[PDB]
């Protein structure tokens, strides 16, 4: 159905690309990758974490409460 050639109209855009045998596959895999990963993690942690922290708290409280309930009481 959809094929290359008339998917959309584009004008005045130039693209430069380099052959895969003229360049490295791992340019800066440790010097620059790790700061980017830290940036992404810092961005996402505040959105993703608090629900799972709350689940952890509920899990601990429920397990402790069940264990306390099972044990017998004096009198």
């Amino acid at each position: 159905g959809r094929q290359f050639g008339h998917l959309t109209r584009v004008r005045h855009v130039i693209t430069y690309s380099l052959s895969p045998f003229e360049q490295r596959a791992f340019p800066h895999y440790f010097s620059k990758g790790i700061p980017n990963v830290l940036r992404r993690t810092r961005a996402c942690i505040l959105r993703v974490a608090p629900p799972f922290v709350a689940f952890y708290l509920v899990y601990t409280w429920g397990t402790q409460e069940f264990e306390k309930s099972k044990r017998k009481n004096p009198a």
């Binding site: 004008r11 693209t15 690309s17 380099l18 052959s19 003229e22």
Partner: protein, 49 residues
């Protein structure tokens, strides 16, 4: 090239071109060097054409 004789052209050149300098003043000798070739792509998108 055409209708002419070689010695006449040589004499005229001796008359009118002997003033050119050809000593390569100092190390001003522009010499080419090998040029690197790169496999690559360039694309200018102009859908109006």
């Amino acid at each position: 090239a055409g209708g002419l004789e070689h010695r006449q052209l040589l004499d005229l050149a001796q008359k009118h071109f002997s003033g050119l300098s050809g000593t390569y003043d100092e190390d001003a000798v522009p010499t080419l060097s090998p040029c690197r070739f790169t496999g690559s792509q360039i694309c200018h998108r102009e859908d109006g054409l």
